[PDB]
Amino acid sequence: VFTFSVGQHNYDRGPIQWMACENKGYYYEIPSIGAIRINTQEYLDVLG
Amino acid sequence: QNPLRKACISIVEWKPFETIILLTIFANCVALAVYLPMPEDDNNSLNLGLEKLEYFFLTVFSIEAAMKIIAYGFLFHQDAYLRSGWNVLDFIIVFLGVFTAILEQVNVVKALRAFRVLRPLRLVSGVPSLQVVLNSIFKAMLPLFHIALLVLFMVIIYAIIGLELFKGKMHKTCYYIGTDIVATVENEKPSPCARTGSGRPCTINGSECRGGWPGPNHGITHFDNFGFSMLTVYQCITMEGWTDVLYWVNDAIGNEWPWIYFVTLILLGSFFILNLVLGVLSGEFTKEREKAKSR
């Protein structure tokens, strides 16, 4: 499970990190358009 | 009114029910403030709990009303209760409360939840000191009548003047050529333009002055009808962003005349009227003090 927390908000992010860490996955944050490219290609480090 | 047939509850009405209702309203306020408004009809667990807490705050405030409506007359019996100044306000709060919380359980709208924000007012009925204070600031404006009646007509006169002069003038702007992308620079808010006139002409490279643009502030600041002219005049009167309106009228119709309209609106409307109001209030504070010092 790779979980992405998109946007700039105040909602809690604990559970989403847990979902990512409890399921052999990873947790990414995408706050703007500039972060999209580098955060959407970075799961191929976990897959390898 | 009637005998002591039902009025076996007025016995407690004079107990320390001050604290029991003050704290209940205070907890209602705190439960109103921890609510978290979510968009597009989402929700979270907590909000769904603070509604299962509204029938607990809309019950206490209803039985503490059916405890006083049967302890004074048939309803009032002399126009006492509902004609008591504040006890009718509490009754209206408990009226809209149950009315709206029942109307919601019928079509199982949300705008009806907005009368729920009056419940903090029952604190001013709670203590007496705030009753006498809220009755002072309502008596200090009996003299401020003529000044408000002089401001209401200056806003109305300036709305009509601006409606005559600048109606439908801020509607063209510098678009990119053959495109619907308004052309600006880094910190420039989109201002009007003029092709073959006296207003400002487009200076961005590939840009043209063309019409069919709603207006400066997403279509809110303009003198296109009476409502919007009143809105923008009132906004300049409070001296907030009046220079933006001036600069936009400059950019549309020309540089030399329009300042008379605004420099005079800010001198008369803002400084003069504020002077009047300060004078009329201190002339009422010093008088009441010279009368209450004599006690």
């Binding site: 700039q8 | 002072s136 003529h146 907030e240 220079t243 209030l281």
Partner: protein, 819 residues
């Protein structure tokens, strides 16, 4: 000891007011060992004066009740860092308490202790009327969470920090709308959150119209019922060539040299206007260089003023100060103007009064500057793009997306930018707090401070939402409280240079004179006079005026709007000729309101004629149909009274407004010289609409800064970095050289002066009319005597002196307060 103790406190003040960002290590040492010696010196102070003034007199007096708290905390804070006090934010507030210890000692002086017995009682007695104001803000915060809570779901990338998403944010937004700062931006977000500028969406303007009007009115009964009750009782307790042919012409030759100084060309160093004005230069120098001799060889502070003015104008036939030092030409007017001397002297002696409250606000603002440095020092840096957080990362280039579109981008070099109003040293903190006090751009600083992350790191959205309190307590003290007891100061002071009733009555009855009425003979037109002054006719014309107004408003953008104007023009000109058929044209113009209506009927006629001539083969003549509704004012006797009471007093104190006009003149000329070669680039604050090229543009800019528009952005728009105008005369490659740091002195000074004068100007006009405001309309007054005059003139139509004895019946047309 009374002065060694203050030497101690001054050393401690200077040790606290030198903590800046990136200080040298020796300064850190000098400070960390200079408080230790003063802590060990304040340890013995509560042991010696516990021995000289007895022991139990350390607690029965409030003054030194805390000097033990000073050290009790000092020692406590001295051993917390070295045990567990991590969180530099928490360590930063430990040094704040230190500031409190300095405050108790500084306060000693009679003037600085006599007022807390009044100021503290002002707050503590009236802390119940503060509760209603806090409850107003708490109701409107909740109402905003309802209306706009979670409705700012805009699909762009523009950041709208002032929203209503949760309770602290809604409280911040409502507070900002109360102070008035940028409330219109919040309104536009609210109107776009709903549909748009359509029918149901614009109705949420109301929330912002009642919150600003009814919320700024409780702030007149809160912070200004304090400085009319709890500052008046405080002072009440403390109570317990000599012709008109030459001098009146040489005065007139200052008003010409000054206007020649105004209309100059600062851009082109040598123009025809400058070449032409260079002759009036020598003329206006020479005359006053040959008019000092007549006034100093015939005779023996004010004329040396003139001689310096003419000396600087002669040595000008670096050297650039010669052209700024010449701008004090309008100040020799006070020399010959006798009417203006007496107002400038009141302005000079109005300052001995404000030195006790103006020095308590600067010390209060200096207390907050050091707290601000303790909190926000170094934290106001940022990167161009908010993804890099240290200066080592904020290098290179990055993409920006126009309109928020991921396929339309641009390369920008990213740079580690420091804010413009930061809090690094106490001078910068003091400048920032100054701009916050005038309410301008304070939410930008608030949100820059809520996001402050660490010492050399960039911002973290919504990090410390409690740092709002710092900005909201300051604003409550300085801008709302001290700025109100200072005005109350001025008011109750002017109350001294400003019984009664019997006096004014006997002067009224003695000086007053009865009225004219122009009652006619010749019944043919007596008939028409009987209807002209009937209540039916008067209460018909008001209806016609209201209907005219409603017709004038019904128009909109995209004919009937003209024929109806023809109709109303006709109806009013017929009433004018119908009244001339009654007042014989001699009693008609005797009444000013009738002259004023005659002035509008002609304007309307010309209006319609010009419209029809344009259509048959002047956009401002259309204001005559609009002014018709101003003559609704012959009936609103209360409102007309209220207008005359203040016009008579603006027409009585013009020499004070002359001060404001001279201030604008001097400052506009100085600024036209200093920063007048800056380029007019759009997207900045020195642009085509707001610049210093000509004289009207400079005066409009100054008037904009007086109102409190973004005067700090204009201040930053001219400070030695500014591309020079192309038409200017300057060395090549010397482009980025226009603008001066003198700007910081120019604006900060202007504002203060202009904020001062205006206040002055308000209270004069107020106190000048203090009879009308502080008046009972129930016991007596000049209104009763005016009504007596009315019933008199009813029986004696023309004045012609006084009337026959009996028709003594009038005591039935008399109100009981008179008979």
């Amino acid at each position: 000891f009374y002065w060694l103790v203050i030497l101690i406190v001054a050393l401690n003040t200077l040790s606290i007011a030198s903590e800046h960002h990136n200080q040298p290590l020796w300064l850190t040492h000098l400070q960390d060992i200079a408080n230790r010696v003063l802590l060990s010196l304040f340890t013995i102070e509560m042991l010696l004066k516990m021995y000289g003034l007895g022991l139990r007199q350390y607690f029965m007096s409030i003054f030194n009740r805390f000097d033990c708290f000073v050290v009790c905390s000092g020692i406590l804070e001295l051993l917390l860092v070295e045990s567990g006090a991590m969180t530099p934010l928490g360590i930063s507030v430990l040094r704040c308490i230190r500031l409190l210890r300095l405050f108790k000692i500084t306060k000693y002086w009679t003037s600085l202790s006599n007022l807390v017995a009044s100021l503290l009682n002002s707050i503590r007695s009236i802390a119940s009327l503060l509760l209603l104001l806090f409850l107003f803000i708490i109701i409107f915060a909740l109402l905003g969470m309802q209306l706009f809570g979670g409705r700012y779901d805009f699909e762009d990338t523009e950041v709208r920090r002032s929203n209503f998403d949760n309770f602290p944010q809604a409280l911040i937004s409502v507070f900002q709308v109360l102070t008035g700062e940028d409330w219109n931006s919040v309104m536009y977000n609210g109107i776009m959150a709903y549909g748009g500028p359509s029918y149901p969406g614009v109705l949420v303007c109301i929330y912002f119209i009642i919150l600003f009007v009814c919320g700024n009115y409780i702030l007149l009964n809160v912070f200004l019922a304090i400085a009319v009750d709890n500052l008046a009782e405080a002072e009440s307790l403390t109570s317990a060539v000599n012709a008109t042919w030459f001098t009146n012409f040489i005065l007139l030759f200052i008003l010409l040299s000054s206007a020649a100084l105004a209309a100059e060309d600062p851009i082109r160093a040598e123009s025809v206007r400058n070449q032409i004005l260079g002759y009036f230069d020598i003329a206006f120098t020479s005359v006053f260089t040959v008019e000092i001799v007549l006034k100093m060889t015939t005779y023996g502070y004010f004329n040396i003023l003139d001689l310096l003015v003419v000396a600087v104008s002669l040595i000008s036939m670096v050297v650039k100060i010669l052209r700024v030092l010449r701008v004090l030409r309008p100040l020799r007017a006070i020399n010959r103007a006798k009417g203006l001397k007496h107002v400038v002297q009141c302005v000079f002696v109005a300052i001995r009064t404000i030195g006790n409250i103006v020095l308590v606000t600067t010390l209060l603002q200096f207390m907050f500057a050091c707290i601000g440095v303790q909190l926000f020092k170094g934290k106001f840096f940022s990167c161009n793009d908010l993804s890099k957080m240290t200066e080592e990362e904020c290098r290179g280039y990055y993409y920006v997306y126009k309109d928020g579109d991921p396929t339309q981008m641009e390369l920008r070099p990213r740079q580690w930018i420091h804010n413009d109003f930061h809090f690094d040293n106490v001078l910068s903190a003091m400048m920032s707090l100054f701009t916050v006090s005038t309410f301008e751009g304070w939410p930008q600083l608030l949100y820059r401070a809520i996001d402050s992350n660490e010492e050399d790191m960039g911002p973290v959205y919504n990090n410390r939402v409690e740092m709002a309190i710092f900005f909201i307590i300051y604003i409550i003290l300085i801008a709302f409280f001290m700025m109100n007891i200072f005005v109350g100061f001025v008011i109750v002071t002017f109350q001294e240079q400003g019984d009664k009733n019997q006096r004014q009555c006997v002067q009224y009855a003695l000086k007053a004179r009865p009225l004219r009425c122009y009652i006619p003979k010749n019944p043919y037109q007596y008939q028409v006079w009987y209807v002209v002054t009937s209540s039916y006719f008067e209460y018909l014309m008001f209806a016609l005026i209201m209907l005219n107004t409603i017709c004038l408003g019904m128009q909109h953008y995209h004919h009937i709007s003209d024929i109806l104007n023809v109709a109303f023009t006709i109806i009013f000109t017929l009433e004018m000729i119908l009244k001339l058929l009654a007042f014989k044209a001699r009693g008609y113009f005797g009444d000013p309101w009738n002259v004023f209506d005659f002035l509008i009927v002609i304007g309307s006629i010309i209006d319609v004629i010009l419209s029809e001539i344009d259509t048959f083969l002047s956009a401002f003549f259309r204001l005559f149909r609009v002014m018709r509704l101003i003559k609704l004012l012959s009936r609103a006797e209360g409102v007309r009274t209220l207008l005359w009471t203040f016009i008579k007093s603006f027409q009585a104190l013009p020499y004070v407004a002359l001060l404001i006009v001279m201030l604008f003149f001097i400052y506009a000329v100085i600024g036209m010289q200093m920063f007048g070669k800056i380029a007019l680039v759009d997207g900045t604050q020195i642009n085509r609409n707001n610049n210093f090229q000509t004289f009207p543009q400079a005066v409009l800019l100054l008037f904009r800064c007086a109102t409190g528009e973004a005067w700090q952005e204009i201040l930053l728009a001219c400070s030695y970095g500014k591309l020079c105008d192309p038409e200017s005369d300057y060395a090549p490659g010397e482009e980025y050289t226009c603008g001066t740091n003198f700007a910081y002195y120019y604006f900060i000074s202007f504002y203060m002066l202009c904020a001062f004068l205006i206040i002055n100007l308000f209270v004069a006009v107020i106190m000048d009319n203090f009879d009308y405001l502080t008046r009972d309309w129930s016991i007596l007054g000049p209104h009763h005597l005016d009504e007596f005059k009315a019933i008199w003139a009813e029986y004696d139509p023309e004045a012609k002196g006084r009337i026959k004895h009996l028709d003594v019946t009038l005591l039935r047309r008399i109100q009981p307060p008179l008979g």
